């Protein structure tokens, strides 16, 4: 596509407007249309794509958890049917994002900053599928994408915010999805410690970006230990 007749620059401009208006479904559709133009995305454009779909799937995850909790308590067909409706819509959003990464964002991403960003996303959207799955193959798909993205360790410094956000999300995968709380804690601790030892190399602006994600690693470790 419905965005096939709109200029790429117009879709990006409208994604930024939709973000200002908190219209995240519109923002996601504008960024899908921008991706389908077939050109690689800039750093800013990758971030618009991620923020749009994170917000959309975030609403669906929050709704699914409410309906799942009611359904569990209730144990008529209505609660199950409506939880299934929301689950199917969530799966469709995850499949759309995985479709964009596979056709053809990942294969055309050669720089570490782009390839790690897209592989982290692929891990995240398999993780969201795993949260509602009843499932082993989905978990291994998440793991595989996260692992390729981590193997960041070769190309990025330990304070790189993309590398930090990847390790954050991979640690939560381990804790919540893979039932590996010790792996989760080890990854979060090592990631935090290696970042802390590299902070001395950063400007005031990079330091702010790195320490914000380090605080998320610390918040998890506080809950986990």
């Amino acid at each position: 596509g419905a965005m096939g007749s709109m200029e790429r620059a117009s879709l990006i401009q409208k994604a930024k407007l939709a973000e200002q208006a908190e219209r995240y479904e519109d923002m996601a559709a504008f960024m899908k249309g921008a991706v389908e133009k077939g050109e690689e995305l800039s750093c800013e454009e990758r971030n618009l794509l991620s923020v749009a779909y994170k917000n959309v799937v975030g609403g669906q995850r929050a709704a699914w958890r409410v309906l799942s909790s009611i359904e569990q308590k209730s144990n008529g067909p209505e609660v199950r049917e409506y939880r299934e409706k929301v689950e199917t819509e969530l799966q469709g959003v995850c499949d759309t994002v995985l479709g964009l990464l596979d056709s053809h964002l990942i294969k055309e991403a050669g720089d570490a900053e782009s390839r790690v960003f897209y592989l982290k996303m692929k891990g995240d959207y398999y993780r969201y599928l795993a949260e509602v799955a009843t499932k082993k193959r989905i978990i291994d798909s998440a793991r595989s994408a996260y692992q390729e993205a981590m193997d960041s360790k070769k190309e990025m410094p330990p304070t790189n915010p993309i590398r930090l956000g990847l390790a954050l999300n991979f640690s939560v995968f381990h804790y919540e999805i893979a039932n590996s709380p010790e792996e989760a804690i080890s990854l979060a601790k090592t990631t935090f410690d290696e970042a802390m030892a590299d902070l001395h190399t950063l400007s005031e602006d990079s330091y702010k970006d790195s320490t914000l994600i380090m605080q998320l690693l610390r918040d998890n470790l506080t809950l986990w230990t």
């Binding site: 991620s50 923020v51 994170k54 917000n55 975030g58 982290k120 995240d124 956000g165 990847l166 954050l168 999300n169 939560v172 804790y175 919540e176 994600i213 998320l216 690693l217 918040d219 998890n220 809950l223 986990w224």
Partner: peptide, 7 residues
């Protein structure tokens, strides 16, 4: 738990 980016 905390994951990267918005809610």
């Amino acid at each position: 738990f905390k994951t990267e980016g918005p809610d």
